[PDB]
Amino acid sequence: VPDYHEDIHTYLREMEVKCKPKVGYMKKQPDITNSMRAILVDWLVEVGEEYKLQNETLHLAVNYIDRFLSSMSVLRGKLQLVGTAAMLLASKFEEIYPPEVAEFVYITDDTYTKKQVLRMEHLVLKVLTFDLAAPTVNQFLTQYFLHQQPANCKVESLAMFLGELSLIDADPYLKYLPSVIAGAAFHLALYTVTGQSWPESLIRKTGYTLESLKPCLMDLHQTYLKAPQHAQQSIREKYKNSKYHGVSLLNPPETLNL
């Protein structure tokens, strides 16, 4: 409904800077790693599938985790609890029908009690000072999709896929803002399917160019090439389904010609 499309995009651009997690945070965690984070996010993706949650809900939850972990040191035995509550909070924000608390307890295989989940919910709301309305890669892609001429469902679904893969690896994707990752993923998807490129219309909207996008784009391209070998595979599996036009089956381009 382009009467607020511009204002909204500007606003998200400002808010993504303020809601950004701290890039180096895992260095300062004594007992957890990037690779343990990779396992958490991958499981959250399955969780999202299991309960048919929105992708947006998945992106938010990750954002909540990364922000929470930017200031709170957490023991590995507790990382899955942080994640669970994060996903519950995201579900409550974003979902018409969030899963009820028991369900969240259940998908951990009764690892934590209902009381723990609810306490961690409260702790997370505190540490985040209730600031839950964070921009995601998903929110940017969705706007960028309006610039397709014409609309192509494979590109959309593929861009989603890629943006989703970026959630798994804090190194390097924590360095990049949602809007830039979305840019990269959009370009990469469009090029893979149609041969077309980041359109002039988005240069005007975003002020990003292939040049500004290159660093993230180089990374994301590697990630896309190496995706079948990645220790975490839930996202590839998820995007095999028809609902997403089987885009995880498409072959990545061997070169980007940049």
Add this chain to the structure above:
Amino acid sequence: SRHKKLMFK
């Protein structure tokens, strides 16, 4: 199964 306890070893 997605109902796993995560074992971070």
Add this chain to the structure above:
Amino acid sequence: SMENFQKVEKIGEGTYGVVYKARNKLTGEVVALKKIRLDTETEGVPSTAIREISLLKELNHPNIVKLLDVIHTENKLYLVFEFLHQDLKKFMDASALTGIPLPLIKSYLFQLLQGLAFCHSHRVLHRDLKPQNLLINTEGAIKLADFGLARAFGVPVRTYTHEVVTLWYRAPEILLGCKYYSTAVDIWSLGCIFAEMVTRRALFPGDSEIDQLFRIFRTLGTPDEVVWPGVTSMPDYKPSFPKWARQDFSKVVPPLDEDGRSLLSQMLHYDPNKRISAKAALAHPFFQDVTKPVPHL
């Protein structure tokens, strides 16, 4: 925590708690506390409260009720709001003999529109605009309140909660089951409110969905593909809908002048894409001589 607040009196009631007038013993500030009950073994912090708080910290605007603070105890959650004298309904009732002076209706509309355009600019839908949710102070301000039903939206929008907006103020696209609704639904409610400030009675007071629909149809004409492309395909569209002729708007709200009439029609356009935005409405000739008078009482 509440240590520095002296409760004064219950102000009204909500969903999972209550609202009190209270006073900050140290600053003097008079506030409203919205007490939200938690416990545990429940589902924790209610999604309504999560959305209200997060969305309201992002919306600082002179025509949006200000969230001052959140007091988040192990036991209770207390929302601290700036205090406003009264609500637009508790005011139209008190003017049920006077009537509301047009400059006041105009100021109120203009302020409401400003608040709404802010919400929409920050990707927030209100989804429950009605007179009881709009608060007025003694200095002539009016403000959008109760963001209980609000939600952050995307561009373009997805499908969000069907069950939405108090009935009398509900838009026809919601009534007709559209998988997609947007900012336009908030304008519809403001339209209904505009009428209501003018006549002192609700424009469309149905008691059911179909009743609501038909009351809207008899007033604005039953929509066809001409006035609203796609209607006949909408999920709860029935070809057996009686086809009523559109009324002359001068009859819908007799006291309104030309410009008011014009604005009202734009705010109650069937096709949500054609319905006027809050932003564009701010430039309506209706508002040329607008000021901000104190409520005449």
